[PDB]
Swiss-Prot record, chains A, B, C, D, E:
It is found in: Nucleus. This is Peptidyl-prolyl cis-trans isomerase FKBP53. PPIases accelerate the folding of proteins. It catalyzes the cis-trans isomerization of proline imidic peptide bonds in oligopeptides. Histone chaperone possibly involved in H3/H4 deposition to the nucleosome. Associates with 18S rDNA chromatin and negatively regulates the level of its expression. Interacts with histone H3. It comes from the Eukaryota. The chain holds residues 2 to 96 of 477 of the full protein. Broadly expressed in leaves, flowers, stems and roots. Detected in root apical meristem region and pollen.
């Protein structure tokens, strides 16, 4: 089952893994539409832990990058932060 | 079993996962023949949900990119949209 | 068990998956030795179907690229076509 | 379950796999914030063995790279060394 | 269990998979330290078969590349050849 999520830039965006039925496999991060040349980073913060940079995407150089991440119900607060002004599309599959 | 699909640009193209016997693993997106330098994106729309950018391919820079996507019979309407004028070949395997 | 195959350019080259004992996992395509700068593409044609571009390799920029392809005995005619004049080494493992 | 670790540069940093409940899958190395252009390498030393370079990251060119590494309780001393002055965020999942 | 091997350049280097307890997963090839700009290739020769190029690494452009290779006890003679003067670190995990 295909899975997708657009994580908007600016204000950091929360995400709830329990919304989906099964485990989320984040296998790709794709840069959204935009005009800024600045490097874009998506950071994942679990609970009160410090954010961990999932990947770095370079506009016009590397606009997509493979990922291998698994999100389940165990980490109750999942909070995605995106640097820059371009959205980052996370794609993958369920279970 | 090898699987392949050429998703044409321009008018967005529907796809029916039930045509194949088993689950489709989309493990690669390869840029088709063409002369345009513009960045090419393939977007996947499931049902009425907003399209999610699967990957971004740069002509003459990144003409192929690994993917890890699984398509099955559960998502009845699967609709592939390709930006640009170059076709995008999706390759992988069944089951 | 390691698996490898050099697919020569020019005249398109047939391949028989039944030669090996188990399923072939094509996990990498590496550009062979050569002097041409042109982009090299390996296309896979199964039966009478149209060729599907497996990957695109750029000399001096991207001379290798990860793949995730599975070839078994079910597809009787497997026919590899390579664009350019550089051979493409397919590497992986069996079963 | 998401896993993350920031490996600081400079003095080499020890890591204890037994802290986590399950096996650690290091599936990505992402360059941390910084201004240096020099290439950054994270080296893994197990026991008394010589360090093995896990990956090389180029600032402003390749700031993230996929990995497939599994760390468990069997290797008691695990010692991460990072070259350069930029931290390297290791991300993945447990078990 | 982490696995690592430094394959030296120059004279081609033999390797014995039976030294390790379990199957070797070669999931990454990282360029070693060096000053040469020439492209570096690691070739795998099994038995009397012709060498198959595992991957091609470009200094200062692509110093690491993901791999998916499995080496076991079945291929008795495994012989790694590295082009160039830079060593290539193979990293992965056992079993």
């Amino acid at each position: 089952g295909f899975w997708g999520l657009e994580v908007k830039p600016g204000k950091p965006q929360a995400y709830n893994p329990k919304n989906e039925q099964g485990k989320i496999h984040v296998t790709q991060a794709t840069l959204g539409t935009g005009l800024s040349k600045e490097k874009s980073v998506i950071q994942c913060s679990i609970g009160d832990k410090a954010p961990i940079a999932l990947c770095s995407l370079l506009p016009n150089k590397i606009e997509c990058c493979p990922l291998n991440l698994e999100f389940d119900d165990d980490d109750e607060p999942v909070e995605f932060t995106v640097t820059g002004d371009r959205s980052i599309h996370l794609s993958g599959f369920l279970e």
